[PDB]
Ligand binder design. Sequence first.
Ligand SMILES: Cc1cn([C@H]2C[C@H](O)[C@@H](COP(=O)(O)OP(=O)(O)OP(=O)(O)O)O2)c(=O)[nH]c1=O
Ligand SMILES: Cc1cn([C@H]2C[C@H](O)[C@@H](COP(=O)(O)OP(=O)(O)OP(=O)(O)O)O2)c(=O)[nH]c1=O
Ligand SMILES: [Mg+2]
Ligand SMILES: [Mg+2]
Lengths: 198, 198
Amino acid sequence: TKYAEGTQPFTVLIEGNIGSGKTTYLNHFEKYKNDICLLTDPVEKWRNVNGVNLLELMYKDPKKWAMPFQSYVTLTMLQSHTAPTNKKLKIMERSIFSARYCFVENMRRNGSLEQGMYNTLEEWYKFIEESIHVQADLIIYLRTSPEVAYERIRQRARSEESCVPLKYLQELHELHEDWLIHQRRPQSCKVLVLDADL
Amino acid sequence: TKYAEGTQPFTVLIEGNIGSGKTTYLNHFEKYKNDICLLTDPVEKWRNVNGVNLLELMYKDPKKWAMPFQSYVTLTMLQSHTAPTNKKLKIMERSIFSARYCFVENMRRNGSLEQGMYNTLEEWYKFIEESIHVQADLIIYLRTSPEVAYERIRQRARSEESCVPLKYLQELHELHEDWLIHQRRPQSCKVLVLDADL
Ligand SMILES: Cc1cn([C@H]2C[C@H](O)[C@@H](COP(=O)(O)OP(=O)(O)OP(=O)(O)O)O2)c(=O)[nH]c1=O
Ligand SMILES: Cc1cn([C@H]2C[C@H](O)[C@@H](COP(=O)(O)OP(=O)(O)OP(=O)(O)O)O2)c(=O)[nH]c1=O
Ligand SMILES: [Mg+2]
Ligand SMILES: [Mg+2]
């Protein structure tokens, strides 16, 4: 009796650090557009919310903007998770799970999110889990070293990501490990590990 | 196919300004506890989120805390709107509609919520409308003058509300009028007006 329950096909989630090549990997499935539902680069939504760049505001002023930004990230993931499709396969760049277990968690650790903000978000995640169906059958984890991840972010040269230190990517990498390999976080899904260092 | 669709009885929403006597009115239905589902004073949740007083933080630092606070207000309203009950009647203090049309809107107007924060919240409200069933059959509008509303807030003497000016209550009153009498906002429901000046 959850929202979008029984309306979703086999769902594959593409995960990995910033600049791990999530979009590049999903760009290979481009020939089967009419066969597979492909939702790539949700970051473009976050860079342009009716003209407002939430990603830029988050990086410039985390103490003020990390909360509304993560809230919006959660929303867009949800809208993608529950989007209607007549296709037999759906591949998604990112998910609600990485937003929660990797990014929200690290922003709690580094002090970008105050306790009250972290708690508000966590209580939202718990309610979403009982109200909204999130289809997750397989997660492909594009495993990279923080050094290679940093290389790709530099080459793409998003103005918002120009101040991102290697320390930040090292933290996120370890959280990706905790969630997808070390199972320190609650998630019941099949994970395929890939060496994404080309 | 929305969450909690077809599981909700006749729902009455009690609305009105801060200190309009919403709880006092609902306290009269106290004898029929086993007959009517009574969810009063959701503000107590906001004053204590695992020990964090979000209401106090919002009033102390609106530019930083109005966003997470309204996000949590929305959540608690949703949890109350969709709460399971075997009773034939449900009466609710406040709703998701007043949080959106009165409080979020006024915080946008006074600059407590930046555009990006207002937009994030508004996009959440739009998605909630398609995903989650909100039962609303009758709204009882306890109509007060901002002066009488101010009187009651002072007598209750919530430490968080000690700095609330009459200007703020005048703004909220007019928004309550716009929504429930003047129909300035895209909404349609049964409204019973009451003179709550004792
Ligand atoms: C998912 C998510 C991303 N972000 C940020 C980190 C990044 O700067 C940006 C998008 O990163 P990613 O979500 O990793 O997407 P990407 O396109 O950068 O990945 P790839 O290069 O492998 O295709 O948004 C958050 O701040 N919080 C979140 O919850
Ligand atoms: C509903 C709501 C309340 N608030 C704040 C305003 C008040 O300080 C506090 C509770 O206000 P009310 O929701 O009006 O609850 P109340 O108990 O004060 O009402 P009454 O006296 O009529 O029983 O929470 C918001 O900031 N945003 C909201 O969306
Ligand atoms: Mg990408
Ligand atoms: Mg009350």
